[PDB]
Structure 1
């Protein structure tokens, strides 16, 4: 019978790829359908390029793809429209914001699978040790805490200890971290939903100069090559006071044999001042049936299974990844395992989006511009003022004649 082949998630990021393969195998066993899992590189932008090889070829060699929240406007031609396959009631069980994100010129490109938002991880044992009662609310506070805790932990002999780790590598994750910096300084959304390229302003420039000021000071010099897992591994070994990362890191830090098990909490990222907005960049992944799949019916069945209540529950309980079904946020088992899902639900709902809707199919080019200009500030090549002016000019060229 048919072999249903799935490309999604990566065995190089946490347990996501292993868990995904397990879920696809469970569907295959449940339905008596052969399945195969195709692995992917860690970074989302490398995955996009890989999957674009399949799509360009109209390849039938992958039936189901796990696609990033930023991709629908790029990948729509390659997606089977799912709208005819779901009832209005089925579709209402997901967050409407994500269903809307995944709908491009009427085509339901993909079902919401898990959402994501950037959050602050903090070592509560260390905050207590050094006389702090709450995590930092402002970036200045985060810097002051990091400097004091670092000074003490270095003096006590942990030469591997840093104050803050984050994603500073030149790739899509840096666009995520930088949106949070810029937005949390009142510097805007880089490209506004209306199309205005707003990034050339002094608040955005200050945000980027501040992040430069971390590098080699409270954050490792090598932070400029960190993606999610590099940051996580310094954190998880017990070598950072603070980390910016996504929800998946929580379950991994609580696992038996983690050096930091029981020693951390999570909160919203800091912001420049009390009247700036909170920033958490919206992430997450969706499930797309290939337009080139020879087995659309079977593939839609697998996608509905993966997106179901019990598979998303399993994702929440075991991998601390955020459901796209509001009903799961009231599930007693989800909440007992992850109480912080309730505490931060409003942060998740108010997550700020990257400019993928407004840039549409040109988003990847826009983002490459952003992460390269931001990276030039982190590396000390440019000051924030020059980088936001140069970025404005690049994005203007990229989006000229796009509506």
Structure 2
């Protein structure tokens, strides 16, 4: 009978691709339906270009796509409206914020699958070894701790040891890190939900100069080419005091044979001062049925299964990825495995979004300008002051005549 073909997640990032294919195969086995998994590149913006090839061709060759939180405004024409396939009570089992994110001009483009937010990973053993009893609350403290711990560990002979690793490659991940820097210095949201391009200000400038000041000092020079997995691999081998990353790194760090198993915790990212806002960029992925699927009914059944309570629970327990169902945050098994799901719930609830709603279908162009100008500051090519000014002008061009 039909073959239900799924493109979602990547075998190049942690266990997400492997686990995704396993779930899709379990749905196939359970329902007696043939399925195939199509693998994707690591980086979201590369996945977007890949999938856009299928969409442009109206291709029936993928039935189900895992789409980024930043995509609904872009991909809406390519999505089957799910709204008629769910009751109001079913829909309300998901967080309203994400359902709303996924709903474009009344169309429910996708079901919420897992959410994410940026967080600070930190080595507890190393903090204790150097006399610190809490992870840093401010960026200055992160720097001070990173310098002292690095000096010590280098002297003890770990020539691989760094203070801080993050995503500084020129891609969507840098847009994520950079929104956290700017917002946590009181510099705004780059583009505000009302359309105001606010990034040209002295706080945003300072946030970027500060990041520049990390490169080759407390962070490796090569951090300007790091995505999620490059940062994670330095961290996970035991070679970084701190890491900025998404929740999925926690379960990987705790796995049997991880050199850092039991040595780390997580907390909110630092901020410039006590009265700045906490910054955690909102991430996460959704499940879309293709408008070009020849098998909508079967594809919707697979998507409902993937987004169900027990599959999200498995995602939580085994891959430490955040559910999109409030009821899982009180589940005894989810919580015992990841107590920090409860500790940082308010951080996840206040996560700051990238400007995907306000930029809509032009978001990818906006983000590319953002990561290229930010990157120019990380490389030392421009100061923050010049970069935010150039960014403002580029975003103004990009969004001219665009209204939300």
Please say whether Structure 1 and Structure 2 have the same fold, judged by a TM-score greater than 0.5.
yes
- Distance, in Å, in 2 between the alignment partners of 1:150 and 1:4 is 50
User: TM-score by structure 1 length?
Assistant: 1.00
How far the C-alpha of 1:345 sits from its partner, in A, is 0.3
Q: Which residue of 1 aligns with 2:20?
A: 20
- Distance, in Å, in 1 between the alignment partners of 2:121 and 2:88 is 38
Deviations 1:55-93 (A, max 9, x none): 000000000000000000000000000000000000000
- Distance, in Å, in 2 between the alignment partners of 1:102 and 1:157 is 50
Q: Which residue of 1 aligns with 2:185?
A: 185
- Distance, in Å, in 2 between the alignment partners of 1:318 and 1:105 is 35
- Distance, in Å, in 2 between the alignment partners of 1:308 and 1:322 is 13
- Distance, in Å, in 2 between the alignment partners of 1:345 and 1:315 is 17
How far the C-alpha of 1:49 sits from its partner, in A, is 0.1
Deviations 1:336-383 (A, max 9, x none): 000000000000000000000000000000000000000000000000
Deviations 1:257-299 (A, max 9, x none): 0000000000000000000000000000000000000000000
How far the C-alpha of 1:163 sits from its partner, in A, is 0.1
SS in 2 for 1:158: coil
- Distance, in Å, in 1 between the alignment partners of 2:31 and 2:229 is 34
- Distance, in Å, in 1 between the alignment partners of 2:158 and 2:311 is 41
- Distance, in Å, in 2 between the alignment partners of 1:96 and 1:34 is 33
- Distance, in Å, in 2 between the alignment partners of 1:288 and 1:247 is 22
Deviations 1:202-227 (A, max 9, x none): 00000000000000000000000000
Structure 1 residues 25-44: aligned runs within 5 Å: 25-44=25-44
CA RMSD of aligned residues (A): 0.3
How far the C-alpha of 1:402 sits from its partner, in A, is 3.8
How far the C-alpha of 1:180 sits from its partner, in A, is 0.1
How far the C-alpha of 1:54 sits from its partner, in A, is 0.1
Deviations 1:291-346 (A, max 9, x none): 00000000000000000000000000000000000000000000000000000000
Deviations 1:166-188 (A, max 9, x none): 00000000000000000000000
SS in 2 for 1:70: coil
- Distance, in Å, in 2 between the alignment partners of 1:226 and 1:327 is 35
SS in 2 for 1:352: coil
- Distance, in Å, in 2 between the alignment partners of 1:102 and 1:160 is 42
Structure 1 residues 3-402: aligned runs within 5 Å: 3-400=3-400, 401-402=402-403
Question: How many pairs are equivalent?
Answer: 403
